[PDB]
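Example complex used in Figure S2.
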Amino acid sequence: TQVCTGTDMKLRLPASPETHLDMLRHLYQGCQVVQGNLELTYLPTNASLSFLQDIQEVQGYVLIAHNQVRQVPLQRLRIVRGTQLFEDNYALAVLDNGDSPGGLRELQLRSLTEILKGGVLIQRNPQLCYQDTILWKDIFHKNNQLALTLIDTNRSRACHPCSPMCKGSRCWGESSEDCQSL
Amino acid sequence: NIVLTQSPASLAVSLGQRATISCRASESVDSYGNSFMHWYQQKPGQPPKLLIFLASNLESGVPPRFSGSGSRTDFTLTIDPVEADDAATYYCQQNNEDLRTFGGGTKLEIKRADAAPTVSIFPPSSEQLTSGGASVVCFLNNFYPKDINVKWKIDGSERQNGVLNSWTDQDSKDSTYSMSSTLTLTKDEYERHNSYTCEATHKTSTSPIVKSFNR
Amino acid sequence: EIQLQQSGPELVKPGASVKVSCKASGYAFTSYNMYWVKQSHGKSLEWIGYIDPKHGGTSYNQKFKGKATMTVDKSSNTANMHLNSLTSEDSAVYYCARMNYGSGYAMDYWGQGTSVTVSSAKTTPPSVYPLAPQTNSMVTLGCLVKGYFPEPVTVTWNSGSLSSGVHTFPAVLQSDLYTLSSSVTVPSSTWPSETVTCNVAHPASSTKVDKKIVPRD
Ligand SMILES: *[C@@H]1O[C@H](CO)[C@@H](O)[C@H](O)[C@H]1NC(C)=O
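Predicted assembly (614 residues):
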């Protein structure tokens, strides 16, 4: 498969919106396996992110933070290995996305079935729905001994229920294609 | 859940001998080229202390008399040479899954030479008698092994009811035990009789050690 | 040096709740997860959960979900564990312990433990009685500490200047009262010529008493 190298920018503000998006597009276009951390930060509402759509594996951690963009197209992401972790604890960190209102509306991690190491931190995403419905224990791998969670569900909009097609009312978004594969 | 089964549950080892404690896991505790097995020492009334981490790594500051070996489902803590300060309970613990589990513990008794108890009997205090009660106390101090029999005799007749016994844990310096036996009576019942005796029978002699007083 | 300082022993009524605290010093508190562990008397260690102090992520043993709640107070470098709806089966020693990533997530520094007693029995100070004894070269003296609740008491001899040769026995509970004894052995040349006094502190009843040992007839 096509591999790319990840970043280690964490929450630092980029030097320029243009050079930032250009760097991410050139890094991840066509990429399937990120050998490193997938950090997606400070992206504005009009950001074109189709270049992420082939990512299937992240070897480090995924950080989605300080974005106004309403969707992040990671529907093909199947595994986060967590060989590096955000704050040495979290394999998936979704932070401060927000503030039509800006801000991530759904995670839409339809293919995510395994986190091998590290936990899940979801904080201060005022338009984010459904993150409380996910059974994270079905995603943490059996040898993941940092399977800790903090899922902030405070939000500023009312969420429509998971699709009635979804078993156990667990979903990554409103669509019947967004049910959690359990 | 990974179940950890320690063997033996207790053992007695003499100074200078080798102690071997085994931890058998119900499934592998290995992943990513690591054995997620650790070992702790807990002295009575203290927190556990880390000895060995990741099956074989000696924790800094721990004497190299301690070592760990093994892999997959079978692990061993070795103490060689055993020293008096090793009297303690030892635990294995794994975290190859998020659910941490511990073994049931192995109690290590230090085998020293047998020692007879030093026996002392004490009458009820005038203060307690003034309050209406009457406790007779017998101390049986610094003996080994722990097994011991105490008998209370009142005017030559044995009394079993109303006796409370308490043992210390094995001493970390001299590897002995001590015990107290307390016979509690009412003042009026205490005043019914004259001779009070505690008789200590211990492996070190066929003859009991007898201490007595007359009210 | 790294230290984890836990709050003192707690007596709580059945059905109530208790907060156990664990103050960390000697390292960056928010850079390490904190484990919580239960040990019932004479039993093995049980994992309750662990918490990340920086962002508050938690992982609980399912067995303790909803009995225990872990929180942190970063300003005071303190991890707290709240136990709710307490029963007799919650009487135990509770430990905090630091998680070490590099050491395979081992528990490398432990607090001293907080003993929680769940009970309806009333706090009662001890009665302290002298145990007075000669022919021998060493003489054994003692103090009987009777009828107190809850644990613990602290027994010293000569205000702590007699520390060698002491045995303080574990307390035994009877009809909601504890009793224990303490013995001290000294050269017959130091008693009765010089005085020997036990001092018994019982913090839960805000008492501390002295009993001088005088020869029996
Ligand atoms: C997105 O919006 C910003 C203003 O917020 C603008 O400067 C930028 O050129 C826009 N980008 C695209 C691709 O339209």
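Residues A 44, 46 surround 2-acetamido-2-deoxy-beta-D-glucopyranose (CB under 6 Å). Chain B has two domains: 4-111, 118-214.
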